[PDB]
Design an enzyme around this catalytic site. Sequence first.
Site, PDB file in Angstrom:
ATOM      1  N   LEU A  14     -54.260  21.318  17.229  1.00 25.40           N
ATOM      2  CA  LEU A  14     -55.203  20.353  16.623  1.00 25.40           C
ATOM      3  C   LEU A  14     -54.778  18.917  16.840  1.00 25.40           C
ATOM      4  O   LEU A  14     -55.603  18.024  16.923  1.00 25.40           O
ATOM      5  CB  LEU A  14     -55.410  20.601  15.111  1.00 25.40           C
ATOM      6  N   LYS A  16     -51.109  16.050  17.661  1.00 28.82           N
ATOM      7  CA  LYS A  16     -49.738  15.580  17.435  1.00 28.82           C
ATOM      8  C   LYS A  16     -49.790  14.166  16.792  1.00 28.82           C
ATOM      9  O   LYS A  16     -50.773  13.433  16.970  1.00 28.82           O
ATOM     10  CB  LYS A  16     -48.957  15.525  18.767  1.00 28.82           C
ATOM     11  N   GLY A  20     -44.737  15.180  14.050  1.00 27.33           N
ATOM     12  CA  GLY A  20     -45.346  16.441  13.603  1.00 27.33           C
ATOM     13  C   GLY A  20     -46.425  16.947  14.559  1.00 27.33           C
ATOM     14  O   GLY A  20     -46.978  16.193  15.383  1.00 27.33           O
ATOM     15  N   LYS A  41     -48.742  22.883  10.086  1.00 29.02           N
ATOM     16  CA  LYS A  41     -48.016  21.717  10.589  1.00 29.02           C
ATOM     17  C   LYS A  41     -46.536  22.059  10.788  1.00 29.02           C
ATOM     18  O   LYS A  41     -45.929  22.707   9.935  1.00 29.02           O
ATOM     19  CB  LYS A  41     -48.215  20.491   9.662  1.00 29.02           C
ATOM     20  N   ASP A 130     -49.822   4.986   6.434  1.00 29.77           N
ATOM     21  CA  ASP A 130     -50.410   5.330   7.750  1.00 29.77           C
ATOM     22  C   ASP A 130     -51.937   5.518   7.621  1.00 29.77           C
ATOM     23  O   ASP A 130     -52.534   6.402   8.268  1.00 29.77           O
ATOM     24  CB  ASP A 130     -49.744   6.637   8.235  1.00 29.77           C
TER      25      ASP A 130
HETATM   26  C1  LIG Z   1     -54.000  12.657  13.333  1.00 31.84           C
HETATM   27  N1  LIG Z   1     -52.716  13.292  13.089  1.00 31.84           N
HETATM   28  S1  LIG Z   1     -52.434  14.755  13.713  1.00 31.84           S
HETATM   29  O1  LIG Z   1     -53.132  14.729  14.972  1.00 31.84           O
HETATM   30  O2  LIG Z   1     -51.028  14.986  13.721  1.00 31.84           O
HETATM   31  C2  LIG Z   1     -53.192  15.866  12.551  1.00 31.84           C
HETATM   32  C3  LIG Z   1     -53.885  16.984  13.039  1.00 31.84           C
HETATM   33  C4  LIG Z   1     -54.458  17.898  12.156  1.00 31.84           C
HETATM   34  C5  LIG Z   1     -54.383  17.665  10.756  1.00 31.84           C
HETATM   35  C6  LIG Z   1     -54.974  18.605   9.768  1.00 31.84           C
HETATM   36  C7  LIG Z   1     -54.274  18.852   8.560  1.00 31.84           C
HETATM   37  C8  LIG Z   1     -54.771  19.747   7.599  1.00 31.84           C
HETATM   38  C9  LIG Z   1     -56.001  20.379   7.840  1.00 31.84           C
HETATM   39  C10 LIG Z   1     -56.705  20.133   9.037  1.00 31.84           C
HETATM   40  N2  LIG Z   1     -57.877  20.757   9.269  1.00 31.84           N
HETATM   41  C11 LIG Z   1     -58.569  20.545  10.405  1.00 31.84           C
HETATM   42  C12 LIG Z   1     -58.064  19.655  11.354  1.00 31.84           C
HETATM   43  C13 LIG Z   1     -58.745  19.371  12.647  1.00 31.84           C
HETATM   44  C14 LIG Z   1     -59.798  20.180  13.082  1.00 31.84           C
HETATM   45  C15 LIG Z   1     -60.411  19.929  14.337  1.00 31.84           C
HETATM   46  O3  LIG Z   1     -61.488  20.674  14.796  1.00 31.84           O
HETATM   47  C16 LIG Z   1     -62.421  21.313  13.914  1.00 31.84           C
HETATM   48  C17 LIG Z   1     -59.959  18.886  15.125  1.00 31.84           C
HETATM   49  O4  LIG Z   1     -60.552  18.658  16.356  1.00 31.84           O
HETATM   50  C18 LIG Z   1     -59.939  19.269  17.520  1.00 31.84           C
HETATM   51  C19 LIG Z   1     -58.893  18.091  14.694  1.00 31.84           C
HETATM   52  O5  LIG Z   1     -58.484  17.052  15.524  1.00 31.84           O
HETATM   53  C20 LIG Z   1     -57.477  16.054  15.179  1.00 31.84           C
HETATM   54  C21 LIG Z   1     -58.275  18.360  13.460  1.00 31.84           C
HETATM   55  N3  LIG Z   1     -56.868  19.046  11.152  1.00 31.84           N
HETATM   56  C22 LIG Z   1     -56.175  19.276  10.014  1.00 31.84           C
HETATM   57  C23 LIG Z   1     -53.707  16.528  10.270  1.00 31.84           C
HETATM   58  C24 LIG Z   1     -53.100  15.629  11.158  1.00 31.84           C
END
Ligand SMILES: CNS(=O)(=O)c1ccc(-c2cccc3ncc(-c4cc(OC)c(OC)c(OC)c4)nc23)cc1
Length: 280
Positions: A14, A16, A20, A41, A130
């Site tokens: 999802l 980086k 993390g 994560k 952040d």
């Molecule tokens: C922006 N910081 S990060 O990229 O490290 C990150 C990535 C994911 C999450 C995260 C933390 C907790 C729950 C989450 N649920 C869905 C998605 C998520 C879903 C996606 O698709 C439905 C998506 O698109 C590919 C996406 O992109 C960043 C994140 N992400 C979640 C938090 C920080």
Amino acid sequence: TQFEERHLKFLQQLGKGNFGSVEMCRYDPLQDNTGEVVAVKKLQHSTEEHLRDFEREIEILKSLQHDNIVKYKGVCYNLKLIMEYLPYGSLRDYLQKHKERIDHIKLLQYTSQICKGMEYLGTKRYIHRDLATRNILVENENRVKIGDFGLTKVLPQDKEYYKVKEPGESPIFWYAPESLTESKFSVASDVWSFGVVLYELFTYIEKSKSPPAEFMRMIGQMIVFHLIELLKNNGRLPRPDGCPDEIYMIMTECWNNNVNQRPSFRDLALRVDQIRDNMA
Ligand SMILES: CNS(=O)(=O)c1ccc(-c2cccc3ncc(-c4cc(OC)c(OC)c(OC)c4)nc23)cc1
């Protein structure tokens, strides 16, 4: 709230950010494809120093229960944080994807939710450090959540700011001047960054209008030095295309050089909620 590694099935990466990494997994302990999909994560590379920060991040998330904060579900231990999966992804991507279908009233609904989440952090003396649309997640069309706490700190018992200087690329174009000059982070610097979030929303994430694009333009290795000078000189991000004056004024007030003169999150929520009503 203890998840077994063997039962987590990888589905996709999802994202980086800040050392993390987050995956979409199905937690399927009955191995019959009936388990829920969850977000997982992990550290990109596990130092002892980074492991200790990660453990504190987990504790912070676990201590938060709020409609506008992503739900902690548990841990898996290579320590892994297990969270609810929010199906619409990051507000940054969602907004950009649906810009022609999301009006100002809807942006203010999201803005209001972000303020309430942040006020709640404030009550625990947590400093997010952040705040950016990339760190806000979309549960459904009516509900967003602060979705990452990787840089979040707890204020010392006896001070209103926390000084910290980490290795890595800092998101300098969302930082308050005193965060840039003195490495000081506070509720007030979160307010500053919230003003940048508000700017991001009202530009609808237009690439050429991003805070790094606009500030780079205004400045023309010493980029931080010249950013600092620009801000001390009252250089600011412009009013986004279509942004009303009263919303741009919320931004400019968040962006006060005087730390103590920035609005509180409670007052931000009131003003936003009032403007929302006036528009409805
Ligand atoms: C922006 N910081 S990060 O990229 O490290 C990150 C990535 C994911 C999450 C995260 C933390 C907790 C729950 C989450 N649920 C869905 C998605 C998520 C879903 C996606 O698709 C439905 C998506 O698109 C590919 C996406 O992109 C960043 C994140 N992400 C979640 C938090 C920080």
